[model samples]
Target: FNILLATDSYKVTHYKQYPPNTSKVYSYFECREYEETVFYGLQYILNKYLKGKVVTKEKIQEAKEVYREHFQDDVFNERGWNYILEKYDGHLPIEVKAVPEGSVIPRGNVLFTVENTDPECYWLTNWIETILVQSWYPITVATNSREQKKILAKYLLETSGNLDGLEYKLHDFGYRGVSSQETAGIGASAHLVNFKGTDTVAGIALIKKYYGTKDPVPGYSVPAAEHSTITAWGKDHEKDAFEHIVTQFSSVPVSVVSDSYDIYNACEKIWGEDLRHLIVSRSTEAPLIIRPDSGNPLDTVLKVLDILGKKFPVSENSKGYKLLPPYLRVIQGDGVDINTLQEIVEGMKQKKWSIENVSFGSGGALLQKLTRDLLNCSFKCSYVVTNGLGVNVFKDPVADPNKRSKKGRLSLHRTPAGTFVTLEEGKGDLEEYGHDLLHTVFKNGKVTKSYSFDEVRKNAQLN
Candidate 1:
């Protein structure tokens, strides 16, 4: 059934909920916790622009009353009220036209566009910039991460005896390095669409809100043994190092940092027949995931795996070589970004080593390093114009061709064959050519679209 969506303008009231006395409250709030506001803004713009509709008078009046009630504080009285009124009153509704979240968008493409409904409200458009860009960055990073996952997936299918276990290969270990807590959630949601799992706990809220399921928790799973961390190394700690760690966790698979003292020597010392037999005797289901946190990840993984295979041989079954106890599984963590991950995977294939012999853990590189600049995401005014002489106009100062605003009321066109395009000033017969980009989501100061968190999650998965 067709849906009628209306844009709600009550966000101004929502913005007032935060205490005003705090310095830079707007910046802090937008940076750390403003997705709901941005998402609502998106819904409003989409409905108003794409549905060829406007919020009913009842809804606008309700929003006006709420705005008036909230606009009396010192912050509003000092300088913020005019800023809010300039952007909201008689301005063109914001218009956002974006590709489905999971699609593989390339650099230099127009991922989405925003513009003001009224030319005079141009200044208001800039206020929403940070929030809007925040929405796009994680999606882009997640898309890029998916490409790596897919590449790794193909490699696993070729070298490993089974593809079923490959699903466990994907992990999002970048939350600690993500720009902020909010992007962490967005990044996790984005990765979830492309890979099998993530390790970010906060992402669970977004997953449940935007996507329906949460089987793939971001980062490492609970009980923590399935994951590994780099503790102390070097000669003094070598002999009893692993023993101490294993004793603490008991039957929990633990990987000791073997390289600090002497990588090769430590491998021979800790990964010998004695430790192999002990691991086998322990009755654990999954093999120990050893991490080489330093040196060349690709080279270190290959060398370590080769040495382990020679030291501890697996028996051949009807299917293939089945790993014996204490089998060394390498997880390379040092500087593991997308390019590094790809290179290591390629190197593994060139050497014909089983990827099942390895896993990956990434920190600052994957989480913090990947970005358009220091910021992987941005929020900008896509549309702005003020109401004067009863005419709506669009104006923006950003001059990059990519940054140019999409003028007038626009609609997204998703072709039946699956291609997508955006059209400015599209209406009437144009709606039949493709899926309308915008839809009314709120009206009369109430939500018209009863979108549950599950619906948002599902929409996030759309390509």
Candidate 2:
């Protein structure tokens, strides 16, 4: 709010001329950003602006005060928005339609279409275009999550010879590392595009609310300990902490952070031999997972595995790699991003360690450590109808070949050969080209479509 107090009159200087065709229909807007495919986070943004229960009068009133206090651009609050509210009944006088939330779209393809229902209300969209498509972050995160799944998929296939157990391999440990509650929910929810194991509790509610996940819980978490839990026992009582964990969650899976004093000592001494009989006798139904939260993941994971394996009778699976007892496994939760995750798994494979013997918990890299530029995401208008003229808009800046943009109002469809392409309106009959990939997910200040969590996973799983 204080930021607005300074700009007092925050104005969108460039958006003023957008509705140059105020007297007629400009029923065309193309929503897109960059090449390649990403299909998450769209539902979140649209639900807020287009369909959320935000009061329209308060929206305009705030706009009126800010613009009046700061800059002299009455066009936004007084002229443009006042005219728009009159036209739209305090609703956004625009239609936003998009592909399903998890559909993969190619570079230069339209993700969605946004258009003003009334030509005079064109400024309404122009006023809020930036925020609308800022869905890039979530999209990028989801795409990254999907790509991580692919990597884990490859490693799983190579080491295990099957795709079984992929879903529970990578755990979401990102909730606390994010910026706020909303981000925690949204970012953790994005990670669910791939695996199902997670400690991000907010993501469960987020998926249920926005994507309508059918399951009561979309991601699974086990009873787990952290530094404070172990440290609270005092260094002298570290062994008691481990004893308490196995005793408390004996019938189910439980994880304890083991590096409070010395990770090697905790694993080799306290868990492996000192309390070996106690650990073995407890949970036969679920694994007692151990987490090594410090040091290089490659070294720590291997070391912890060796320690834990000593007490548990090690066995072999079909692929001839060593597997610890079903009641034991290690999760490398520190310093794990996609690359580190893959590297650790690969390292495990080289040492005859089953990829099945370990799992991962990612935090910073899974949620907050990305930007639109990571995927070269760019949002822009491909077509805008003004004054009864449907003009094709594109950009081919003098430099940067990769920066070239698509032209005209576009629809995304898959070719018979299975390639996603953006087709210009009227250049060719849309149905004749191929199956239109874009769906009418939203329109006219209301959501006209839906996506469920199962649908999201299915779409994201598409290579």
Against the true structure, what is each candidate's TM-score?
0.65, 0.91
lDDT of 1 by residue, 1-463 (tens): 1111121233343334423322211110012111111121233223323333233444445544544665543222213333433444322343334443333322322344544333322322334444444444554455555556666777766666556555456566778878899767666655655555566766666656544453444334422322223244445645555655555555655555667656666566675654555544443444455556668888887777767766776443233433433434667756677778888877977776666777676665654555544222434322222222222133354664443433433455565776544445434135675665444332222233434333443444322
Assess the local accuracy of residue 49 in candidate 2 as a C-alpha lDDT between 0 and 100: 50
- Candidate 1's displacement at residue 205, Å, is 4.8
How does each model score on lDDT? 0.48, 0.72
Provide the clashing-pair count of each candidate structure.
43, 6
> Alpha carbon lDDT of residue 402, candidate 2?
72
Q: What are the candidates' C-alpha RMSDs?
A: 10.0, 3.2
Model 1, 185: alpha-carbon shift in Å? 4.5
